Each structure stands twice: as structure tokens, then as C-alpha cells.
DNA sequence: TATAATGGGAGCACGGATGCA
């Protein structure tokens, strides 16, 4: 279904807090803002998909995002706050994106 | 409004009462919706506190 | 990279084999 005003605020609201968020825990872990990215949205994703990112300096792997996941939520409550945030902003994202679809065939009807 | 404490004093026909009241008086934010709420339901803030 | 825009458009004939009622 398409959003309203409100939910299309909300979603792209926790869209870029949840980009902040990966930049605050970038600043605190002190890892690749990338890696942790792909680890949060390999969280949100599931299970279904799991793949080795070209831009990353590591291989992709369940035992790696395991790892960083775990090492992420060692982090205290203030920090690991920042962890739901961007798991959220990853959610709001995939939403936001589903729910544009429509405007891309409108767009791609008259090419 | 409920009271908490009374006291009394006596005075010729008359008592006078002081009343220790307690009670709560609302006050209505209208949300537009470029805004959201940080504050769950039922919730106690304080001065200071971000509401919306 | 910034008004808002949110679901398309075209277009005969007989056989074996299997699928279904």
C-alpha cells in the first residue's frame, strides 16, 4: 500500500537517524561504517540472503556477521542503543523502498 | 481533585478547613505531521523534558 | 541531485500424447 505524508516521514525520519546511528557506532567500535552497515542489514534481510560485498575488505560470511552482531551488542546500553536505531533505519528503508515501486513504472512507461 | 491533608481549626459557629490538594490540569499539543512523538503512553516527564 | 508526480498496452488440419472431468 502507498504511504501517507506521516509514514513516508517516519520511515525516511528513521532512515537517516539509522545512517547516523551506523556512523555513532563507526565512531565507537572504531570498524568500517560499511562493514557494520552490511552486518545490520544482513540482520534485517535474514537468513535468505547472505553475499561478499565488492566494496568491502572482508569476505561476507554468517560466522563474520555472527561476530560483529555479538560484538555489537557487547556494547553498553547508551551504545547499543544506536544498534536498534540503525536495525529500524534498515527496516524503514526496505518499506520505503517497497512502497515507491510504482512511481518507477509510471516513469518507465513513457521510455 | 482529591485532598490529602485536612486541617481544622474552630472558630465560634464556624471551622475553617486548609486543604492539602492534589490534582491535574491538561494541557493540549496538536501534532502536525512533519513531528513525532518521543514520549510513550502514560508516561512521567519533567521540566525539560522533549515531548514532541 | 529537490513543486509534485505512485499498476502497461497490444492484438487450417490432423495427428499423438497427456491431462482432466
Known amino acids: 500500500p502507498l504511504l501517507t505524508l506521516e509514514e513516508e516521514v517516519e520511515l525516511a525520519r528513521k532512515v537517516e537517524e539509522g545512517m547516523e546511528a551506523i556512523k555513532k557506532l563507526s565512531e565507537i567500535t572504531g570498524l568500517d561504517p560499511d562493514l557494520i552497515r552490511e552486518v545490520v542489514r544482513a540482520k534485517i534481510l535474514g537468513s535468505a540472503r547472505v553475499r561478499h560485498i565488492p566494496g568491502l575488505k572482508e569476505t561476507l560470511d554468517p560466522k563474520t556477521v555472527e561476530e560483529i552482531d555479538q560484538k555489537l551488542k557487547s556494547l553498553p546500553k547508551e551504545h547499543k542503543r544506536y544498534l536498534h536505531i540503525a536495525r529500524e533505519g534498515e527496516a524503514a528503508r526496505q518499506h520505503l523502498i517497497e512502497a515507491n515501486l510504482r512511481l518507477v513504472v509510471s516513469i518507465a512507461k513513457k521510455y | ?52
Open chain 2, 1 to 52: 481533585v482529591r485532598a490529602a491533608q485536612v486541617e481544622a481549626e474552630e472558630e465560634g459557629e464556624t471551622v475553617y478547613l486548609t486543604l492539602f490538594l492534589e490534582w491535574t490540569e491538561p494541557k493540549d499539543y496538536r501534532v502536525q505531521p512533519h513531528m513525532n512523538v518521543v514520549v510513550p503512553e502514560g508516561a512521567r516527564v519533567e521540566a525539560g523534558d522533549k515531548i514532541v
